[PDB]
Write a protein that binds this ligand. Structure first.
Ligand SMILES: CCCCCCCC/C=C\CCCCCCCC(=O)OC[C@H](O)CO
Ligand SMILES: CCCCCCCC/C=C\CCCCCCCC(=O)OC[C@H](O)CO
Ligand SMILES: *C/C=C(C)/C=C/C=C(C)/C=C/C1=C(C)CCCC1(C)C
Ligand SMILES: *C/C=C(C)/C=C/C=C(C)/C=C/C1=C(C)CCCC1(C)C
Ligand SMILES: *C/C=C(C)/C=C/C=C(C)/C=C/C1=C(C)CCCC1(C)C
Ligand SMILES: *C/C=C(C)/C=C/C=C(C)/C=C/C1=C(C)CCCC1(C)C
Ligand SMILES: *C/C=C(C)/C=C/C=C(C)/C=C/C1=C(C)CCCC1(C)C
Ligand SMILES: CCCCCCCC/C=C\CCCCCCCC(=O)O
Ligand SMILES: CCCCCCCC/C=C\CCCCCCCC(=O)O
Ligand SMILES: CCCCCCCC/C=C\CCCCCCCC(=O)O
Ligand SMILES: CCCCCCCC/C=C\CCCCCCCC(=O)O
Ligand SMILES: CCCCCCCC/C=C\CCCCCCCC(=O)O
Ligand SMILES: CCCCCCCC/C=C\CCCCCCCC(=O)O
Ligand SMILES: CCCCCCCC/C=C\CCCCCCCC(=O)O
Ligand SMILES: CCCCCCCC/C=C\CCCCCCCC(=O)O
Ligand SMILES: CCCCCCCC/C=C\CCCCCCCC(=O)O
Ligand SMILES: CCCCCCCC/C=C\CCCCCCCC(=O)O
Ligand SMILES: CCCCCCCC/C=C\CCCCCCCC(=O)O
Ligand SMILES: CCCCCCCCCCCCCCCCCCCC
Ligand SMILES: CCCCCCCCCCCCCCCCCCCC
Ligand SMILES: CCCCCCCCCCCCCCCCCCCC
Ligand SMILES: CCCCCCCCCCCCCCCCCCCC
Ligand SMILES: CCCCCCCCCCCCCCCCCCCC
Ligand SMILES: CCCCCCCCCCCCCCCCCCCC
Ligand SMILES: CCCCCCCCCCCCCCCCCCCC
Ligand SMILES: CCCCCCCCCCCCCCCCCCCC
Ligand SMILES: CCCCCCCCO[C@@H]1O[C@H](CO)[C@@H](O)[C@H](O)[C@H]1O
Ligand SMILES: CCCCCCCCO[C@@H]1O[C@H](CO)[C@@H](O)[C@H](O)[C@H]1O
Ligand SMILES: CCCCCCCCO[C@@H]1O[C@H](CO)[C@@H](O)[C@H](O)[C@H]1O
Ligand SMILES: CCCCCCCCO[C@@H]1O[C@H](CO)[C@@H](O)[C@H](O)[C@H]1O
Ligand SMILES: CCCCCCCCO[C@@H]1O[C@H](CO)[C@@H](O)[C@H](O)[C@H]1O
Ligand code: NA
Ligand code: NA
Ligand code: NA
Ligand code: NA
Ligand code: NA
Lengths: 273, 270, 268, 269, 269
């Protein structure tokens, strides 16, 4: 069947189809996804006044990211259940083109909000030393945009053109490495002149940032992580991808925002929690 | 009909179908479910300033749980009405696979939010004595996660593989017993150094916690609580399961959060 | 055809069908219903700080009831338009079982929130004298639950089994009479030791409570209030039922909550 | 094609059908409608503390009206797109009875909230002189209810029974004239004892009130304003009706509420 | 197939259809659109108290615009996915008339809120010198309305009548030039009496305003920017149009509102 430049979920759904567990779990994990984000939105708004005025922009930017993540994860949850329909004869869920093909591209364009804001918000909690605020922000935003746009293009070809998929993925990775480099500097400078408690939290933020952000390229490659005709090029890979995205999203956005909020509390003159 | 690793609601819906009462009630009880949660969300936000600053995180976490519960119970209410469609000839609601099979798994993964937050929030009202905050939190979260994940896997097999269903259910129960054990300690230490009024509320919280949380494994086993081909392996069992879930949800989340709020008030200097 | 234990709306919709006016009005009155509740929600939140801290719980509980009523009335509005579809040949709206049968049961289980909270909230404005707070609350909640659950069961049989319908309805009425009795006591004790202004408002609250709450059993019996094959056992009865529910809901929840808020202001 | 006691939009949609422009515009104007109301809701909440406590009830009642108007205009926007479906052969949108017949009745019952609250809220900004607060409120509410209910009944017959349509419309107009009379008194008394700036705003409120409220009976009669088989008894009349409703709604609710808010500011210490 | 006075997206969708990338991207960019607006709504509400009371109306008006933009961009995102359906045989998305024809007109009527409020809100941050507040406001609102209404009419003819399309577009452009002229005056007077930092921000606001607002007529002409049977009269042009709209919307509404907020902060004591 002719699917063109479509995500591998559609090829699995169109040929093998999805078992009850594969279809239900993907739906459940996406639902948890958007549930977490709307819960996070409420948390970040309600905890604004727990930190000094100077730090509250970080809470606001966390909230901004929650709204974006919620809307996108909600939309993507609906796209999943629309794109795959139960076949009574074989008892599996197959591609339902009437619901449109499933595409992860929704997530990517959403990142155009998330990435810039997540990178930006830490600069409202930590004080830079040697690096200039405007410089770090511009590097984050430029490399953030380029990372997303190049990855966005690549993922359309994840089945139709493995070469384009890997080249665009490679280019995207370059910009990612640059972001990791800059965020490392920001963490280091942020540690300078603050309590050991605040330094400990920034150490945790860096580990969280490194793992959670690396999961995204992992999700990108998921179908081919077990090579050609591998275990992962299947419904199991489809489940894995959306699980990894959901773990990444919760970690990179919510847990990240909570740690920043806790850092803001330690750096606050009035608050001591 | 080939349903695979599907919940028993789908087997009842596909064979016997659901009477008007069975279908309507299940829909009504799920609707009440999400209505209560969105009402609770408003209550917990509006009562934040009724307790001292240090206790307000408990109100916030209650609110967080309400958002999760509302979204999931709302989604599950829609999944119910999508999965079962009226047949004019026989006058019963039968499985409509076009709406997807009904699965309780939505609820389970939601618990990944609810359980950790419900267990966590009490540690913002009560003061521990001998137990370390970080230690209790880690035990709650680990055993909470494992309880849910193992139960989640099990419930897929509640018809297709009774053995897998019971083994995973058993493993889940172990983690549940651990949570009960730790929450007992937390309640006891919480009682130390507070007024009799506060101690009374914690006693109520423990009874509420014990009964409400035990209902979940009850809902898990519901179809087989009257044995093979029993009274409960029917639309009556389907009704019972969603009723028990709804009672459990209201009790474990809303009533729990209200009692914690009342405890916070007694512990408040204002 | 076989409808089983279904509400009479489905039998009218399946046999005679609904005229444009009957179908449209039922949809309009249900829409007004949920519109009023979401408007009320905003009113009750925005007026919280108009009364002393001790009374603000009443505003909060009003808000809680608005969220419940909005969600349920909204759902019920959608259920109405899903359950009845236009037939081009005859130009009437007939039962569309693909949308599910219409059931008022949604409203009933919602009352499990509304009734307990509406009864509870007055105990945050008025001071009891002889009656114990906990005692009144428990009586309200128990009799409230039993009234709803018994009525809920009964309304499933409003066509399929007139006997079960009337028996369950009768049992429900008993619990209702108990609630009326207890609320009367609460009003009387509430009047003791407060300004004439506060006493006037409580007098109004009692009249409102009595009429608005009595409309619900009226809506219950609506199809048979004109007896067998009566004027009301028709689309006109379907319209009447949802109108009475909507009047009752607005009165019992919104107007009630406003009067309590006004009482709270005089006592502040 | 038996439509019975249905609005004229359904007869146009069932016979001639709607051009792309007619169908799209009606959808766009209704969408703008509910967009304005939800935007207004946010405005009225966010500006509550811009006036003295005594005037803030007017902001709250504005908000209440916004919630009502938003919900109704949103529902009516969906009803429009559900009731008329594109026919590929002729390239026009025809009545799709599966979506239900289109009815303006949704709006009318909504007015049971809007009218009483809009009339009520001015009594929280202006001070009466001769007239008693309770008396004016009761007159507004009674005549408001009767105006809406009689008009609601009438509009069902706007095609099926022109006589019933005009009689009920006439009775409704009587109650409307009473409301205009009372609101005039309220404006006059409101002007007494306030700054010239406040008097100017009330003069604007009266002009706004008079024009915006008169548009509703205009929308009522729209199909027949060019007589039997006139230019307006067509998709152009359908467009006109919903445009007039939307202008009226924005004017009577949002602009009205803004002017009252501005009056409240001038009267604030 | 008879489409009449329909947008070119429908002609591309009805003839060649849309590739996976073209259909998915258009859907993604519209989704990003409304996501940004709802995120912006939260930002503008939460940052109200970051500026002095006198400037807070600008935050409120930013919020008002976010509500409008969110609702419309959300509706337009749904209209896109409703109007084009996958064909299994050829593996492309074709016009699905059952979902209604796609029309950008939704956006235009929304601008009736956005344009007046965006132009208005700057007058709550900057101080005019020689120009009268009321005069600037009236010029903005009149020319704003006329620009939108004339463009709205024109875009219905973008395929059916190229002449009407260009004439209405031309008339619209005249009103646009007037708005640019007035906003220039406002920027100049705004710079007078404020710190160099505030002047720098206003300079950026003017550049942002000029580029972002010019994108709209660009989106209008998009299908014909490569001439008849050009590269852009295709799915690539459809993608381009919605991309440009989304860049314009984010720039003209959100970034604009942020810069105004930053200006308000520098002007705050
Ligand atoms: C992640 C854990 C993966 C869980 C593995 C699934 C459990 C398989 C199972 O328990 O069932 C056996 C099947 O019926 C034959
Ligand atoms: C209240 C009930 C009002 C009913 C009015 C019906 C009506 O106007 O009668 C017209 C009919 O066509 C002759
Ligand atoms: C909440 C959203 C976040 C944190 C998004 C992060 C996105 C990435 C780190 C993406 C990285 C990618 C690569 C390094 C290669 C393949 C393409 C991407 C965009 C998935
Ligand atoms: C509001 C959500 C709550 C309190 C969830 C609680 C969940 C449980 C106590 C689950 C227990 C289970 C077992 C002990 C065995 C079977 C599987 C479970 C997960 C249902
Ligand atoms: C806003 C919800 C309210 C006030 C609900 C009130 C419900 C009743 C008073 C119900 C009464 C009934 C009977 C007395 C007999 C028939 C069954 C009932 C439940 C409708
Ligand atoms: C925002 C809602 C408002 C201001 C509603 C106003 C409604 C009217 C002024 C209605 C008047 C009518 C007549 C005078 C005759 C025909 C029937 C009516 C109800 C449309
Ligand atoms: C957020 C909404 C904004 C800023 C809207 C701006 C709209 C324009 C600048 C429109 C301009 C047009 C022309 C100059 C000619 C063609 C028609 C228009 C309306 C697109
Ligand atoms: C900065 C971004 C711009 C750089 C552009 C890089 C382009 C990538 C080349 C990808 C094309 C390779 C796929 C074609 C091979 C094939 O058809 O098999
Ligand atoms: C969890 C998801 C990642 C990998 C999933 C592999 C387990 C097999 C699932 C199954 O079919 O039971
Ligand atoms: C599976 C992940 C579930 C997480 C739920 C997300 C919604 C709520 C988010 C965070 C709540 C955690 C509260 C942390 C409190 C930190 C201590 C402090 O503030 O002093
Ligand atoms: C069969 C299932 C296998 C995978 C299950 C593993 C899930 C583990 C989940 C949660 C671990 C959380 C416990 C420790 C968290 C403490 C973090 C902190 O200190 O803030
Ligand atoms: C009014 C509501 C319920 C009573 C209905 C009886 C009158 C019928 C109205 C009509 O047919 O026009
Ligand atoms: C009490 C007020 C009653 C007023 C009612 C008037 C409605 C008049 C309807 C006219 C019906 C005309 C019949 C016909 O033209 O065939
Ligand atoms: C503008 C809306 C007002 C109504 C009058 C309509 C004027 C006719 C122009 C549209 C042309 C058409 O009907 O296709
Ligand atoms: C491309 C999408 C980017 C838009 C981001 C969405 C929401 C608005 C966020 C506001 C940015 C905060 C600026 C911080 C500041 O300057 O104070
Ligand atoms: C003023 C611009 C008018 C342009 C005329 C349209 C040209 C044409 O015939 O295509
Ligand atoms: C006054 C506004 C101008 C209307 C412009 C109409 C021009 C369309 C030309 C039609 C044609 O002859 O093809
Ligand atoms: C791939 C994402 C494309 C984003 C760019 C959109 C601007 C419009 C022109 C695009 C031309 C190339 C699109 C294609 O690959 O078919
Ligand atoms: C720090 C003061 C400057 C305020 C500027 C406001 C910026 C708003 C958010 C812009 C984010 C841009 C990053 C992604 C670019 C997308 C390009 C495609
Ligand atoms: C599935 C495991 C549950 C984890 C939920 C916790 C989310 C936030 C954790 C980070 C904040 C820790 C602060 C502790 C004090
Ligand atoms: C099924 C019945 C559940 C009803 C719960 C109502 C919705 C949540 C709101 C809870 C409000 C309870 C009021 C507590 C009063 C505190 C005493 C001081
Ligand atoms: C018949 C096979 C069922 C047994 C599966 C139990 C899995 C145990 C998990 C460890
Ligand atoms: C048809 C019912 C109309 C009421 C709905 C409006 C929602 C509640 C608003 C109450 C306003 C009353 C204020 C009076 C007290 C001062
Ligand atoms: C069947 C139950 C009907 C009544 C609802 C129960 C009340 C739930 C919320 C109250 C929680 C306890 C408050 C004590 C103070
Ligand atoms: C086509 C109609 C457009 C209406 C746009 C308004 C949408 C609702 C928001 C109202 C904003 C009112 C602005 C006036 C503020 C005056 C403040 C003076 C102090
Ligand atoms: C401080 C100035 C006081 C003015 C208050 C007037 C309220 C304005 C309402 C919103 C904007 C109205 C005009 C919008 C632009 C024109 C759109 C109409 C097209 C027919
Ligand atoms: C860094 C990760 C790159 C690994 C390269 C994986 C090569 C995958 O190879 C592809 O696998 C598909 C399904 O498995 C097959 O259908 C394709 O024919 C095949 O080209
Ligand atoms: C308390 C937990 C243990 C209960 C185990 C009950 C065993 C049920 O046994 C099962 O019952 C099904 C429905 O009746 C049948 O269809 C299955 O064939 C049968 O294996
Ligand atoms: C209010 C309590 C009195 C109820 C007694 C009314 C008896 C109605 O009787 C019923 O009327 C239905 C409607 O016409 C018929 O369809 C049934 O056949 C008939 O049993
Ligand atoms: C302002 C008061 C309006 C006067 C009544 C107008 C009389 C219209 O009369 C009606 O016009 C319809 C329009 O086509 C025709 O279809 C009807 O047959 C005709 O009765
Ligand atoms: C000033 C902006 C440039 C306007 C150039 C108008 C020329 C477009 O010309 C048009 O191109 C369409 C696309 O193929 C064709 O379908 C039409 O037949 C053709 O008239
Ligand atoms: Na599906
Ligand atoms: Na159903
Ligand atoms: Na219908
Ligand atoms: Na349509
Ligand atoms: Na589509």
């Amino acid at each position: 069947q002719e699917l063109g430049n479509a995500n591998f979920e559609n090829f699995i759904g169109a040929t093998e189809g999805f078992s009850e567990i594969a279809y239900q779990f993907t739906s459940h994990i996406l639902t948890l996804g958007y549930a977490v984000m709307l819960a996070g939105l409420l948390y970040f708004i309600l905890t604004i006044k727990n930190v000094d005025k100077k730090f509250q922009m970080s809470n606001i930017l966390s909230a901004v990211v929650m709204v974006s993540a919620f809307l996108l994860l909600y939309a993507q949850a609906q796209n999943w259940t629309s794109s795959f329909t139960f076949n009574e004869e074989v008892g599996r869920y197959f591609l339902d083109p009437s619901g449109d093909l499933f595409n992860n591209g929704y997530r990517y364009l959403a990142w155009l909000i998330d990435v810039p804001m997540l990178l930006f918000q830490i600069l409202f909690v930590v004080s830079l030393t040697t690096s200039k605020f405007s410089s770090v922000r511009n590097q984050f935003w430029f490399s953030g945009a380029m990372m997303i746009i190049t990855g966005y293009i690549g993922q359309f070809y994840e089945v139709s053109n493995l070469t384009a998929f890997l080249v665009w993925g490679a280019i995207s990775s370059a910009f990612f490495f640059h972001i990791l480099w800059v965020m490392k500097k920001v963490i280091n400078e942020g540690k300078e002149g603050i309590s050991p408690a605040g330094q400990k939290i920034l150490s945790n933020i860096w580990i969280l940032f490194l793992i959670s952000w690396t999961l995204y390229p992992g999700a990108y490659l998921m179908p081919y992580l077990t090579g050609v005709d591998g275990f992962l090029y299947s419904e199991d890979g489809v489940m894995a991808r959306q699980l990894v995205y959901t773990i990444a999203d919760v970690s990179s956005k919510v847990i990240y925002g909570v740690l920043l909020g806790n850092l803001a509390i330690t750096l606050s003159k009035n608050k001591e929690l």
